[PDB]
Design a protein around this ligand. Structure first.
Ligand SMILES: Nc1nc2c(ncn2[C@@H]2O[C@H](COP(=O)(O)OP(=O)(O)O[C@H]3O[C@H](CO)[C@@H](O)[C@H](O)[C@@H]3O)[C@@H](O)[C@H]2O)c(=O)[nH]1
Ligand SMILES: Nc1nc2c(ncn2[C@@H]2O[C@H](COP(=O)(O)OP(=O)(O)O[C@H]3O[C@H](CO)[C@@H](O)[C@H](O)[C@@H]3O)[C@@H](O)[C@H]2O)c(=O)[nH]1
Ligand SMILES: [Mg+2]
Ligand SMILES: [Mg+2]
Ligand SMILES: [Zn+2]
Ligand SMILES: [Zn+2]
Ligand SMILES: [Zn+2]
Ligand SMILES: [Zn+2]
Ligand SMILES: [Zn+2]
Lengths: 385, 382
């Protein structure tokens, strides 16, 4: 894989937020006597795989066609561990388990699968002193976030260094291969234990392709405005406010609180800034000397995700602007810019005070020993030989 | 890369057609010390690339969005030599030359490019003892087939062993990568110098394209059964835009003109090496031909929704069979019926015997190498 080097890179405390990098070549081949370029990076097959050998790929699903999910699976590079994080209907979940098993079996690779609403996991969490995801029903709430949270836990338990997420509503397995390799590419270019990689795909000049465009644009702005509010300079750096397909080294993943809804992606960035932007004093000694790199990689393969959702669009916007409005870094100027976008579209007339998004605190607080203690008689269930 | 094992294999003279194989895993990793076997084919990354280091990948284009073509290029595995065969308008060709030059420089890899209507090549072919694809104007005829012929000449010259084709109307570089890894996957599983790999995929739109290719496939299978004496289901890639072949094979093979290119490749295989007619080629007699058919995980999602061509595609293919020297009266009539049934005059129906260029083997490479001497500069994207 050959990417561009980011021409500029926003600095913000110890966070280093790189400008978008285009991928020029999907597959760079095998390094020998190559002539060094200063404007782009070639990443060697070998090293990409070695990185993927330490990488967990979470595939979250809630009643997604089986064909699709199989498609996605066949597309994940061999070296990565697969975790299906399911929340499907009980029937479908079984079908998913059998699907994974055929797959892991035939391709001689380890995987894990689990279900969001599994009581075993709920007590596991709670024993490890992490009761926050559980609901009135005594089970973990439905929500992609809560699924990811549990996937993070497995990632942690399985000793993988990096976690990446790939959505299962992906028609193109070849795409998935790229996104996953691009994660590994990010982590290679990184020179910090604490790295994040976010995939985007921009569309350059309708119903779906048109008016979702102008919302990510707005969403992206509100992040840049948030940064601007602090540095005292405008910036156009953030282009991945929502980035479903994103990855992070586990060391950083466990450090970040997560939000509940569509708010999840945007929050991560806000969190990073609040935590490591040098404004509030910084506790974490190992981050203060290594810093955080954030990569934004522009993929060669389009994001084609099936749907039939309109009111997901409104919400997406709403959630992003919420996380910014309620940031401890939001200057008075930003807060109002944001509130005006909201009202002037769809949310509370007078009279707006957009719900503060609700935040699970970092997993760094979950005693992993307790969890290991608590699922001993079960780990062979989640595990798919 | 992991694939299914073909669950059967038609033997026809020394030709072996494999039943379709699904790719199960796009990327099987590095086989480093690994316990092999099971009922699938696993192909090591290292072996795959060593094969691509011997592979030319031809990208034909007539007047296609540049952004599409950059895409396609970006998906070709690094090891593979890129040949852009152009027949675009004067203006565009320039832009294409630039595009490629940029890409190859930036990614440090050899490419070549030519225009189908370049006079220098027409002179070269005529020198090579091969005037056949030249039109009246004195320039090479338009049509994809003619482009491929030229690209094969470049392939032979560049001394690569294996030639793959990839159409540029392709929206997903990821798909492109899978195709080219599949071509290598094919050649790796072959136990012969003479191998061929053919890729396929599985409103009221694509219903039209379906029933016709299943009809094109059926036609080819009928060709086979009429000879063997027993019906077969095996040909599923009568049309195969994305295909590859070891070069040794390609130069032995006479090429048809229209949408006859793909079907005719199979028919000529069967006629030359099916054991019916005298087969004299000490090497093919002794090594035989393997044809693979690989079902890809990534959809063929191209730039199209037009119906005039579709009929023509059917007519083309059914003609190649009708006019085969292997067709039986039964096989002939069955074609004629479908072909009238769809679109073709009631009485006087005898679909055009397609026109075929003789094998490229019948060409002197040193002659063309002499003739292109002052010109290699402009073809090679230096
Ligand atoms: N474990 C779990 N998985 C879920 C849940 N709900 C959905 N999923 C699965 O996780 C993915 C969520 O995808 P969608 O339901 O398609 O959400 P979306 O509206 O397409 O939005 C996505 O893309 C955006 C683009 O960057 C993202 O902003 C967003 O977070 C999300 O990933 C899907 O693969 C789905 O099958 C859940 O409650 N729990
Ligand atoms: N060099 C050259 N290229 C051409 C010419 N005409 C078309 N091409 C290019 O070669 C490819 C042929 O694709 P289309 O022109 O889109 O043909 P099609 O009707 O889409 O059919 C394609 O797909 C089918 C899939 O198996 C095939 O059956 C068919 O042969 C062809 O590849 C495209 O990249 C096209 O721009 C030509 O005269 N010369
Ligand atoms: Mg989706
Ligand atoms: Mg086409
Ligand atoms: Zn810049
Ligand atoms: Zn996506
Ligand atoms: Zn069969
Ligand atoms: Zn021999
Ligand atoms: Zn195709």
């Amino acid at each position: 894989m050959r990417l561009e080097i980011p021409n500029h890179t926003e600095r913000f405390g110890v966070v280093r937020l790189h400008e978008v990098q285009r991928i020029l070549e999907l597959d760079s081949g095998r390094v020998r006597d190559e002539s060094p370029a200063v404007g782009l990076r070639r990443l060697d097959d070998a090293d990409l795989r070695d990185v993927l050998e330490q990488t967990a790929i979470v595939v979250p699903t809630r009643n997604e066609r089986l064909k699709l999910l199989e498609g996605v699976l066949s597309g994940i590079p061999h070296e990565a561990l697969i975790l299906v994080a399911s929340n499907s209907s009980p029937d479908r979940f079984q079908m998913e388990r059998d699907l994974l098993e055929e797959f892991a079996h035939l391709t001689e690779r380890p995987a894990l699968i689990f279900h969001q609403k599994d009581p075993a996991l709920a007590e596991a969490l709670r024993a490890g002193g992490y009761p926050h995801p559980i609901g009135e029903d005594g089970l973990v709430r439905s929500g992609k976030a809560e699924g990811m949270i549990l996937a993070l836990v497995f990632a942690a338990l399985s000793g993988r260094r990096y976690v990446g997420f790939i959505d299962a509503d992906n028609y193109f397995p070849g795409a998935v291969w790229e996104y996953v390799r691009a994660y590994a590419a990010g982590f290679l270019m990184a020179k910090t234990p604490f790295a994040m990689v976010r995939i985007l795909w921009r569309y350059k000049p309708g119903v779906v392709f048109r008016r979702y465009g102008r919302v990510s644009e707005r969403n992206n702005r509100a992040l840049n405005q948030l940064i601007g509010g602090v540095s005292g300079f405008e910036t156009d750096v953030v282009k991945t406010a929502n980035a479903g397909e994103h990855a992070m080294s586990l060391g950083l993943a466990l450090r970040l609180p997560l939000a509940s809804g569509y708010a999840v992606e945007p929050q991560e960035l806000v969190s990073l800034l609040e935590l490591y932007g040098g404004v509030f004093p910084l506790e974490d000694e190992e981050v203060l000397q290594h810093g955080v790199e954030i990569f934004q990689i522009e993929t060669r393969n389009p994001h084609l995700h099936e749907n039939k959702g309109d009111e997901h669009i409104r919400d997406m916007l709403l959630a992003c602007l919420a996380t910014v409005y309620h940031s401890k870094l939001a200057t008075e100027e930003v807060r109002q810019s944001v509130l005006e976008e909201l009202q002037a579209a769809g949310a509370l007339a007078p009279g707006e005070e957009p719900p503060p998004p609700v935040l699970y605190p970092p997993l760094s607080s979950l005693d992993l020993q307790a969890v290991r203690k608590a699922l001993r008689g079960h780990f062979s269930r989640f595990r798919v030989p």
